[PDB]
Amino acid sequence: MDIQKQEVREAVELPLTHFELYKQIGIDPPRGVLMYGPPGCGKTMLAKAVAHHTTAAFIRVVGSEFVQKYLGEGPRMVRDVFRLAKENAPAIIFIDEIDAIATKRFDAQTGADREVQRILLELLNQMDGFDQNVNVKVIMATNRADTLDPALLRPGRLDRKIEFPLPDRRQKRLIFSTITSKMNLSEEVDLEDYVARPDKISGADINSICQESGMLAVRENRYIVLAKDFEKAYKTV
């Protein structure tokens, strides 16, 4: 890494205070950060790291929070989160899995998805009008970008495309130590074959895999997790 945490650091959390900086420095840093990586679910460890480092609100919303038979409450929700973002604290909006609301469709029998993507174009014009004197920081990541529309990835909207196929061995040691340091550890719990093999096989959301190993240690029969739940959690999930 060393460029992901630095670019997201100075482009996300440094402008998160004294709003006058956005126009004191001139060109406001782009707020659009598009993560990738379809092996695992992912998109959670960094949202938690920001949720613990930065002390602010976080109004997370699943990508299908407004996909209903109605059309309202869209600009009401995003407008209320905008006005509280520029009113109380610039909460970071987490819009994950935009492929459900970004799928191509020409037929008019499914005019609900086309209608809510026309609302997505309405708020697209809103964020077009939200480039001057506004407190907004919306992170938008997904697992597949081959089906994403060109209007979303247009320059000026999403100017950061960070790729994360696999973390390096040092980031493996850190991503395993940050979760095994709190949980029950032992001498059989080793990071050598688990730094070698998970570096060969492509796998994201390693923290979620260790949490699944916690679901394999939730029996309370064995007080300390061992290599059986680790390798079994590797071959299963």
Partner: protein, 224 residues
């Protein structure tokens, strides 16, 4: 409270000298009793790293080759734990230097990967096999070259160890050293006889794996 079901394992873990000697000298059967993890007082005694307790257990004549349900020998415990004197006692009693655990690893993998100089020199001195491969077909040079253990690779090359062990994918330890941008391990292994022609199943050369012009000094050190 208690981290283990057997009391002798909580005593061997908590370092209760006089209480472990009172319990074992009061009942010799408690020494070799098995727990749910198929471990005895020797496994936890070598785990905590106490000299007098493992010298009492090994003094009475506890089987040094007692494996758990997976196959974790006590030498993997003293080597992987990072305890010099415990490895001195286990090697002093005749432990298997090439024991096979669940994944077929040897104490040279865990000892060498943890950058333990004295444990690696003392294990290899007793007659350890440098070319011993686990179930994943990986030796200790993949891990030592993956974590940046330069001096460990060097002292492994003191005992005439091979540097062209193919992994389960086919990557040599040079691919794992150059993958992490280890310039010193690349110049050392290539300067000592590393074969760059051996490819993996992905058909990737060590020059293409490394970036930033490192393949240029790789081929430069190969031709030169």
């Amino acid at each position: 409270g208690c981290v283990s079901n057997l009391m002798v394992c909580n005593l061997a873990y908590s370092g209760k000298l006089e209480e472990l000697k009172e319990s074992i000298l009061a009942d010799k059967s408690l020494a070799t009793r098995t727990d749910q993890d198929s471990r005895t007082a020797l496994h936890w005694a070598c785990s905590a790293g106490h000299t007098e307790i493992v010298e009492f257990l090994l003094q009475l004549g506890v089987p040094v080759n007692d494996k758990d349900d997976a196959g974790w020998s006590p030498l993997h415990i003293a080597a992987s734990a990072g305890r010099d004197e415990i490895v001195k006692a286990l090697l002093g009693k005749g432990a298997q230097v090439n024991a096979v655990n669940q994944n077929g690893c040897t104490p040279l993998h865990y000892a060498a990967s943890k950058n333990r100089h004295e444990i690696a020199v003392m294990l290899l001195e007793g007659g350890a096999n440098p070319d011993a491969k686990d179930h994943y077909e990986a030796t200790a040079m993949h891990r030592a070259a993956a974590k940046g253990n330069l001096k460990m690779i060097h002292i492994l090359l003191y005992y005439k160890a091979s540097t062209n062990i193919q992994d389960t994918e086919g990557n040599t330890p040079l691919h794992l050293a150059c993958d992490e941008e280890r310039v010193e391990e690349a110049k050392l292994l290539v300067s000592q006889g590393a074969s760059i022609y051996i490819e993996n199943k992905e058909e990737k050369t060590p020059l293409q794996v490394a970036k930033g012009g490192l393949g240029l000094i790789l081929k430069r050190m190969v031709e030169g």
